[PDB]
Amino acid sequence: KKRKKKSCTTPKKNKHKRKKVKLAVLKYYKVDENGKISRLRRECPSDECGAGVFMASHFDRHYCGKCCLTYC
Amino acid sequence: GVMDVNTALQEVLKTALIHDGLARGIREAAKALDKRQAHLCVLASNCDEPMYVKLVEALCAEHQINLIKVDDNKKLGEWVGLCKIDREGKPRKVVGCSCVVVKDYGKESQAKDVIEEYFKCKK
Ligand SMILES: [Zn+2]
What we know:
This is part of a larger assembly, with chains A (72 residues) and B (123 residues). With 72 residues, chain A is an all-beta fold. Chain A has a single domain (1-72), classed as N-terminal domain of TfIIb (Other non-globular). Helices cover 0% and strands 17% of the residues of chain A. Chain A has no helices and 5 strands. Chain A has a 3-stranded antiparallel beta sheet with strand order 3-4-5, with no helix packed on it. Chain B has 123 residues and is α+β, with helices and mostly antiparallel strands. Chain B is built from 5 helices and 4 strands. Chain B has helices at 9-18, 26-33, 51-62, 73-80, 110-122; strands at residues 22-24, 41-44, 67-70, 99-102. In chain B, helix 1 crosses helix 5. Chain B is globular, with a radius of gyration of 14 Å. The A-B interface holds A 23, 25-26, 29, 31, 35-37, 51-53 and B 26-27, 30-32, 34-36, 49, 51-52, 54-55, 57-59, 61-62. The complex binds zinc ion. Zinc ion is lined by residues 44, 46, 49, 53, 64, 66-67, 69 of chain A. It is classed as ribosome. Keywords: ribosome, human ribosome, hepatitis-C, ires, translation initiation. Structure of the HCV IRES bound to the human ribosome. Chain A: ribosomal protein ES31.
C-alpha cells in the first residue's frame, strides 16, 4: 500500500494571528492637568490579579484576562 | 561614598537582576509597581511618546515612589541585562528599556550609598 496523497478539503482554516496593539497600555489611565490619576475601568476582586490588574469594559460585560472573571 | 552618582545604578540593577526582582516593559512595570509591592522605579528621559512621561510621573507621584531618569533607552538597555554580547565581549545587541521597576533589592553598600545619598539630597 503506497500511501495516497489526497490533500483536499475546505481550502484553508487560517489560524488566529495576534492583534498587535501599539502602546495600548496607555489607554487605561486618564491624566488631568494637575497630574492626577483617573482609572477609567474597574478593579478585579480575585486574589492573583488583585490590585495589579484591571478589567475590560465590553458593552454588556466586565472581563479580566487573568482569572477570566465575568460580570454584567 | 567614593562612587559617582550616574555609574552606581549598575549595582542596584545587578542585584535586582540576580534576586529576580526586576520588572521591565511598561505594563509589567506600572501594574506591579501600583501593587505597592515595589519600592523604587527607573525611567528613561528621551522618548518619542509624550504620554509615556505622564503615566509614570503621575504614578510615581501618587503612589509614593521615587523617580530616576536616564539619558537614552539604550544605556538603560545595557543596565537591564538585555544586551547580547559577541565572542570577545562586544556589547553588540541592545534592546532598550525605558521602564524599570524594582521589587527585591540585593544587599549592597555601594549602590545604596549613591542612591540613598542622591535621594537624601533630592528630598
Ligand atoms: Zn481577575
